[PDB]
Amino acid sequence: VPLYKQIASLIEDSIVDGTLSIDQRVPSTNELAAFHRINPATARNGLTLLVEAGILYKKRGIGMFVSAQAPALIRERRDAAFAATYVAPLIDESIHLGFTRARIHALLDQVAESRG
Amino acid sequence: VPLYKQIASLIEDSIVDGTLSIDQRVPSTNELAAFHRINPATARNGLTLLVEAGILYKKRGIGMFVSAQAPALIRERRDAAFAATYVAPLIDESIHLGFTRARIHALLDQVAESRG
Numbered sequence A, B: 001v002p003l004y005k006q007i008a009s010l011i012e013d014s015i016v017d018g019t020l021s022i023d024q025r026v027p028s029t030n031e032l033a034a035f036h037r038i039n040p041a042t043a044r045n046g047l048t049l050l051v052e053a054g055i056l057y058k059k060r061g062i063g064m065f066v067s068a069q070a071p072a073l074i075r076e077r078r079d080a081a082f083a084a085t086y087v088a089p090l091i092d093e094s095i096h097l098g099f100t101r102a103r104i105h106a107l108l109d110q111v112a113e114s115r116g
Helices: A003-016 A029-035 A040-052 A070-096 A101-114 B003-016 B029-035 B040-052 B070-096 B101-114
Strands: A056-059 A063-066 B056-059 B063-066
Touching: A003 A040, A003 A070, A029 A040, A040 A056, A070 B070, A070 B101, A101 B070, A101 B101, B003 B040, B003 B070, B029 B040, B040 B056
Parallel strands: none
Antiparallel strands: A056 A063, B056 B063
16 A cells, blocks of 8 residues: 555544544654655655545644544545445345345344354 | 365255256266266265255155255355355444444445445
């Protein structure tokens, strides 16, 4: 995976679990390039990705801050991803095999019980 | 996949979709080894697998027949397989991410609507 994306994702992890709060200062392009030892240009791409995603915003002369709707946008993108990787395949195969909504729900429940 | 299992599975396909009826004669070990050109011993393993699975039974001097509960046993084994490959992963990840039963059902429904 591209580093600029791993960076962005690492930041997203921290805002998803609360480690980074809304409107809190996030390390700048330079601080990331310094700690992790990557090209300032790749760190800036990471943050730029987030900026355009409405996840971060910049305060002139101060730095980058986490946007107030970032925790929502991110929950959204991760739910969509979860669906695409875990739900879609289940649905397409269920249709293919002619299962009913009730039968899928029952199987879900059965498996859920075997766990615990 | 082992041939003796592909054989067994091919037979199961035909009884699952109705092509082969309960108590109907199924090609014997020798007829399979003849049509498909495999070792009679591997064909016999295929059928033996089915015999022990309660899917087929033999009439002395006549041949092999599909058991009356075979269509049930097979539906059962294939549903269990479907669950293990499509439902289990969804459940474990859903637990891991702390999703609710209602949230999973809603996603299932959403995806199902995007299809069609």
